[PDB]
Specification:
part of a larger assembly; 8 chains; A little secondary structure (63); B alpha+beta (96); D mainly alpha (122); E alpha+beta (500); F mainly alpha (56); G mainly beta (181); H mainly alpha (166); A: 63 residues; little secondary structure; 1 helix; 6% helix; F: 56 residues; Eukaryotic RPB6 RNA polymerase subunit; 2 helices; elongated; binds magnesium ion; binds zinc ion; DNA-binding; DNA-directed RNA polymerase subunit beta (chain C); transcription (chain D); cytoplasm (chain D); nucleotidyltransferase (chain D)
Chain lengths: 63, 96, 97, 122, 500, 56, 181, 166
DNA sequence: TCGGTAATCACGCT
DNA sequence: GATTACCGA
């Protein structure tokens, strides 16, 4: 957990944050793509059913 | 008159299945949802102003480039507790 | 201002005390309390300047129980005030669980 | 940016855009809301009714012709000359006073000789 | 309809706090008193509304949907921030004073520029690289550009700094460093030396670590709890901010008129002490600033953290809606993947149904019937969004033409997928989507072979169900989580739901 | 070309949400059915329009 | 001056008209998004011409409608800076005059009109010069130059354009021809 | 030379009195607040306040000595002067940033002006809202304004850069 | 070797 | 109050 991840992934583990959360305040970006972040911010997680990609054409006659 | 609370055990027993649609709908849709206006090039929140319409981010004063972002209310308060302390949380948002 | 509801006040007497042996259930009231103004000039919400009334606070049974009252106490405690004690019982046949 | 990208743009005179207004107004003719066009569209139709000075095709033919005479004349300069219809060196001065190139009286008169044609003469 | 791409952190400049803030606060006062609760300081000086009074910064903004706004404090003297202070010492002992350089030769600059991009991916490998630059600048006292002007050695623990300077011949007096003396040194660092430290020239300037302007948090983050009926318990953050302004106020008057020169430096340290508890109360070497009844104050670092803070307490584990919790009691007459549900819990939980074309004959009857008889509805919804509750005085005018597109909320019936839960949630399998059957009493019932997954027994335990609602999250529950898919277990292959 | 268990529970999920927002139904009628149960009957006869993308 | 655009954009087809042909069902969506809306980048978008090509549908988690990537043609009108324009005086005021140059309007104040002291006749609807007896009144075709454009919001109505006519060879068209002799 | 300009800054910050303090302080090079009061002849309270203001501008330092007997910490002030030509430039750098901006604004701004001895030089933003009349005096607004000064100020900037560049 | 300091210690419920 | 381990002479 203390090794490389998102900086929010290290926030909910090792409640230490003025050691750790203010350290990566200096020159640090944070993209995405954990499992603990997208649940924390409101996005679908990548594992499970958020991995499939759909596509569908559209004449769609009922018959 | 309050319900149950779903700890960190109960969040992880749904990720083990593979349910990602249920995990959104349970934790945020049946909870607090707030709609927030956010600037684009500063990253900070905008400020609405009734009686005079027009919304504008103070920091660098823009006019039209501004949108709406859909996020929980407890995450929006996490922005302010990092804002009272001198940390600045710049948001750099993305199209769908 | 701050009305809890209506037709929850069908058991009270004139002064605000339940005459005993009444089937209090749900969120029915027990003692009707009027509170004093609490900031008369902050709001002025288009009719509240003339109304000048009070902000309703009260006591009501916990919103899952039932039962009937047994005895109502009324006295004065040490300083000068007044405090009423009301107790409500229940029958509770042994069903499942 | 409108949408994702802008890839192509062209310059349209008022005589060219008159047909685009009437063909759009030809739809509606849909009759379920009766489709009345919005206010500023109906206002801009009246501006086409008063400045329709030329045929639609002869304005397109002249605008192609003026670009090939000089290299420093683009479509935007040619589309401006259709609305004004210059007659002499007076209008060539006032249009080209805020351009990147101010014409000489030799080269500007050669432009006038081309626009001696396509005149309504009425 | 956008989404969050990336969150980028940094430090607020004192310039940026002024543009963000709407008011300056100079009055240590809350209400004063019992009528017109408006002051010139810490409360609503166009700062944030928490009461049902509509007065805000010209923007209407009733107490529902009013975001608070930030204020600022013009601190008269500079003050060291607590959390950065461990890393300010790393900067000071690794810079050549009076000029602003890095105490390295151009050879090691040109070599260690190239090592940044080679190890340009992993975090742990570049964090070890920044110590050796700190190592080499420590063991030098002769700089290549100033002729060794008697570099002092810094000192720390916790906040007070010193220097080992010589005065007469070889003296070792410890001149205590002032925050005004520190911040003058930090502004002389050029922006190009910042990649050689762990800093960034646009997001983290080092001189912004010394707080010249302290921002004030909004009203909506510091609520006012009412005690009995009219007495208001002041919030712990509010109570310390009131006491900050009274130690500032005199200090402004103290240096503008008073001239004893001794209490000033004594007052100076009170400022430090008093904001240090406000950032993190439980630091070491600092007596905890108590509340005047016997409770220590939970300031910002304890509101963010503390085993019930705001990562596990409120953000990643939240309280939910549409649930219930009661006891369990067997019955071996229902199938393996059904569940009993009491009819009291069944009439206080609802799913949305969205009448399309072929259930229109059904949901006319579910909404005509009231919320009394068990096939019934509670809340109807128009496509605009104005819900119409059904309880009051008529349902006939809503049981008219129901106008395809609406969404009716009716009670649970025999067939709607629910979930179930045990709470100690040890392994993967103690939540499993069942198939509701409704029976009159007050207990959840449960088939006997499904009780080695839950690891339960029937001596008065408690199991909680919670209905899923939206039509994507409900057809996911039925296909992926029903009981019969979980007859064998992922720990050993052998069957788990079996005979007892 | 058999579907997995994660793709089968997403195709039903997207089709049950279209079938509530308009999108006229195939031969699925009888007598009263919640919008989730209409998607289950359509998937059995193999007349789903929605296809997956398999990144490879 | 009008322009013709060719722009791709992402189209959102709802599932109500899910059973129509993709061309005209995407045309009726994309037309009711950009007509009559002033952007700060290009200008007044008047009308959608036609739909050339369309892509496939893609479902996104949460909505259930489909997304497409179409190609369309847009007629815009851009009053850019230092542009020589033509208009019509359709309003008479004592402090200025609204000149309709198309879908938008242009106000010219009384002291950028001409090289003359200008007196407003209060009884009639006209301007009368001091020395010269030229009369500018209602309905007269003029020629001017843009000097200032005030762009504030997305609405056409609340944005106003400043013009001027203090140059040799502007104003009414018959004033220019009769001053040749 | 250069002594005067230092007094000028002190006059801006303190005044005539502060100028007296500096010259007296130069003579002994080290002094306490009390010792200065005897040298000047003006209350130690006023003298000490002057030193506080100069401290914020970075122009005096102090060292602390431990009195062996009573244990009283008394401060010795001194002047520091290895900071003169940097602070003189770095203040005028920011001022020339401010003087770049004024002429830039004016071009992109004020076109209208009221013809009174007060409230002139309004903007089209105001004017449009204000219906092209003044709300303070009611005079009719006028046109293209301050044409002489917007050229002349541009010539003022170039010398100062050259001067500070030296 | 050798002394020193923080930072950590189930689930739910009253 | 107990385990560690990282940090500091
Ligand atoms: Mg048990
Ligand atoms: Zn911004
Ligand atoms: Zn507000
Ligand atoms: Zn150096
Ligand atoms: Zn005036």
């Amino acid at each position: 957990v203390g090794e490389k991840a998102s900086v929010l992934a290290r926030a909910a583990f090792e409640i230490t944050t003025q050691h750790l959360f203010a350290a990566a305040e200096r020159g640090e970006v944070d993209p995405l793509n954990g499992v603990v972040e997208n649940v924390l911010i409101g996005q679908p997680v990548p594992v499970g059913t958020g991995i499939v990609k759909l596509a569908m054409s559209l004449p769609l006659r009922p018959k | 008159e309050g319900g149950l609370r779903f700890g960190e055990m109960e969040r992880d027993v749904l990720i083990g299945h593979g349910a990602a649609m249920l995990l959104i709908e349970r934790l945020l849709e049946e909870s607090d949802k707030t709609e927030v206006w956010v600037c684009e090039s500063c990253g900070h929140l905008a400020l609405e102003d009734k009686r005079r319409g027009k919304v504008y981010c103070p920091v660098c004063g823009e006019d039209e480039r501004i949108s709406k972002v859909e996020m929980s209310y407890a995450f929006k308060l996490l922005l302010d507790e990092l804002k009272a302390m001198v940390i600045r949380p710049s948001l750099r948002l993305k199209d769908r | 201002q701050g009305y809890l509801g209506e037709k929850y006040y069908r058991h009270l007497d004139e002064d605000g005390l339940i005459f005993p042996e009444s089937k209090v259930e749900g969120k029915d009231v027990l003692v009707g309390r009027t509170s004093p103004p609490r900031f008369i000039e902050e709001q002025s919400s288009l009719g509240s300047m003339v109304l000048q009334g009070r902000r309703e606070t009260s006591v009501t049974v916990r919103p899952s129980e039932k039962g009937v009252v047994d005895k109502v106490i009324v006295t004065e405690t040490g300083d000068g005030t007044k405090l009423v004690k009301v107790t409500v019982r229940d029958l509770r046949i042994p069903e499942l669980g | 940016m409108i949408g994702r990208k802008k890839l192509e743009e062209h310059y349209i005179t008022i005589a060219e855009a008159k047909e685009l207004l009437e063909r759009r107004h030809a739809e509606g003719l849909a009759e379920n809301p009766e489709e009345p066009m919005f206010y500023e569209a109906r206002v801009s139709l009246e501006h086409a009714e008063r400045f329709a000075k030329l045929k639609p095709e002869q304005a397109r033919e002249l605008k192609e012709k003026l670009m090939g005479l000089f290299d420093w004349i683009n479509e935007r300069i040619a589309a401006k000359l259709v609305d004004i219809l210059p007659e002499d060196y007076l209008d060539i001065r006032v249009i080209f006073a805020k351009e990147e190139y101010m014409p000489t009286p030799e080269e500007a008169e050669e432009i006038i000789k081309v626009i001696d044609e396509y005149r309504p003469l009425e | 309809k956008k989404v969050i791409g990336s969150i980028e952190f940094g430090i607020l400049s004192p310039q940026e706090i002024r543009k963000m803030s709407a008011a300056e606060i100079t009055v240590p006062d809350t209400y004063d008193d019992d009528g017109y609760p408006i002051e010139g300081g810490l409360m609503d000086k166009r700062l944030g509304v928490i009461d049902p009074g509509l007065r805000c910064e010209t923007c209407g903004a009733r107490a529902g949907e009013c975001p608070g706004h930030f204020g600022h404090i013009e601190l008269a003297r500079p003050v060291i921030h607590v959390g950065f202070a461990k890393t300010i010492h790393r900067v000071l002992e690794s810079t050549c004073r009076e000029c602003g350089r890095i105490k390295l030769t151009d050879e090691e600059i040109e070599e260690y520029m190239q090592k940044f991009e080679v190890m340009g991916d992993r975090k742990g490998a570049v964090d070890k690289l920044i110590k050796e630059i700190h190592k080499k600048a420590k063991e030098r006292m002769v700089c290549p550009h100033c002729g060794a002007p008697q570099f002092p050695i810094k000192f720390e623990r916790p906040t007070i700094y010193w220097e080992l300077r010589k005065d007469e011949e070889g003296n070792e007096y410890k001149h205590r460093m002032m925050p005004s003396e520190v911040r003058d040194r930090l502004e002389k660092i050029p922006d190009k030396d910042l990649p050689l430290l762990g800093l960034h020239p646009e997001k983290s300037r080092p001189e912004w670590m010394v707080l010249t302007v302290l921002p004030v948090p909004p009203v909506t983050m510091r609520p006012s709890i009412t005690l009995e009926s009219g007495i208001r318990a002041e919030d712990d953050l509010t109570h310390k901010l009131v006491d900050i302004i009274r130690i500032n106020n005199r200090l402004k008057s103290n240096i503008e008129a008073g001239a004893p020169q001794l209490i000033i430096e004594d007052l100076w340290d009170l400022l430090q002490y008093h904001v240090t508890t406000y950032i993190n109360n439980e630091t070491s070497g600092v007596p905890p600033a108590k509340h005047k009844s016997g409770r220590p104050l939970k300031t910002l670092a304890q509101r963010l953290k503390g085993k019930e803070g705001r990562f596990r307490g409120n953000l990643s584990g939240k309280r939910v809606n549409f649930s219930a919790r009661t006891v369990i009691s067997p019955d071996p007459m229902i199938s393996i993947n059904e569940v009993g549900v009491p009819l009291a819990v069944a009439m206080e939980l609802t799913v949305p149904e969205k009448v399309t074309e072929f259930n229109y004959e059904k949901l006319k009857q579910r909404v005509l019937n009231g919320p009394e008889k068990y096939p019934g509805a509670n809340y109807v919804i128009d496509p605009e969004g104005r819900r119409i509750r059904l309880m009051e005085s008529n349902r006939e005018l809503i049981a008219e033409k129901l106008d395809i597109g609406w969404t009716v909320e009716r009670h649970l019936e025999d067939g709607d997928v629910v979930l179930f839960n045990r709470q100690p949630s040890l392994h993967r399998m103690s939540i499993m989507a069942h198939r509701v059957r409704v029976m009159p009493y007050r207990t959840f019932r449960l088939n006997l072979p499904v009780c080695p997954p839950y690891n339960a027994d029937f001596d008065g335990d408690e199991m909680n169900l919670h209905v899923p609602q939206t039509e994507e999250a409900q057809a996911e529950a039925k296909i992926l989580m029903e009981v019969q898919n979980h007859i064998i277990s992922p720990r050993y292959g052998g069957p788990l739901i079996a005979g007892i | 070309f058999r579907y997995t268990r994660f793709e089968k529970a997403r195709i039903i999920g997207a089709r049950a949400l279209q079938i509530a927002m308009g999108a006229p139904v195939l031969i699925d009628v009888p007598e009263g059915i919640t919008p989730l149960q209409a998607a289950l009957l359509e998937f059995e006869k193999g007349v789903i329009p929605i296809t997956v993308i398999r990144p490879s | 001056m009008y322009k013709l655009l060719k722009v791709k954009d992402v189209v959102r087809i709802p599932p109500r008209m899910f059973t129509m042909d993709p061309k005209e069902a995407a045309k009726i969506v994309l037309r009711e998004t950009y007509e009559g809306i002033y952007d700060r980048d290009e200008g007044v978008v008047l009308a959608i011409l036609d739909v050339e090509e369309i892509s496939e549908g893609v479902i996104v988690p949460g909505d259930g409608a489909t997304y497409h990537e179409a190609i369309f043609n847009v007629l815009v009108w851009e009053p850019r800076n230092q542009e020589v324009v033509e208009g019509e005086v359709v309003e008479m005021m004592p402090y200025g005059a609204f000149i309709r140059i198309g879908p938008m309007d242009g106000l010219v104040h009384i002291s950028q009109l001409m090289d003359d002291y200008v007196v407003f006749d209060e009884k009639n609807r006209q301007f009368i010069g001091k020395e010269t007896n030229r009369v500018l009144k209602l309905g007269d075709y003029v020629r001017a130059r843009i000097i200032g454009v005030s762009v504030k919001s997305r609405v056409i109505r609340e944005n106003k354009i400043n013009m001027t006519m203090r140059q040799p060879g502007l104003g009414k068209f018959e004033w220019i021809e009769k001053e040749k002799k | 030379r250069k002594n005067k300009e230092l007094l000028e800054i002190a006059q801006e910050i303190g005044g005539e009195e502060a100028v007296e303090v500096v010259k007296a302080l130069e003579k002994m090079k080290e002094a306490t607040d009390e010792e200065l009061a005897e040298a000047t002849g003006i209350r130690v309270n006023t003298v000490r306040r002057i030193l506080y203001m100069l401290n914020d501008e970075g122009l005096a330092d102090f060292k602390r000595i431990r009195d062996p007997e009573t244990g009283w910490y008394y401060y010795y002030w001194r002047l520091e002067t290895k900071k003169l030509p940097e602070i003189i430039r770095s203040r005028k750098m920011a001022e020339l940033k401010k003087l770049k901006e004024m002429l830039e604004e004016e071009t992109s701004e004020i076109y209208y002006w009221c013809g009174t001895e007060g409230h002139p030089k309004l903007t089209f933003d105001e004017a449009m809202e204000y219906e092209f009349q003044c709300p303070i005096c009611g005079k009719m607004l006028m046109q293209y304004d301050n044409t002489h000064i917007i050229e002349e100020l541009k010539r003022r900037i170039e010398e100062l850069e050259i001067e500070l560049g030296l």
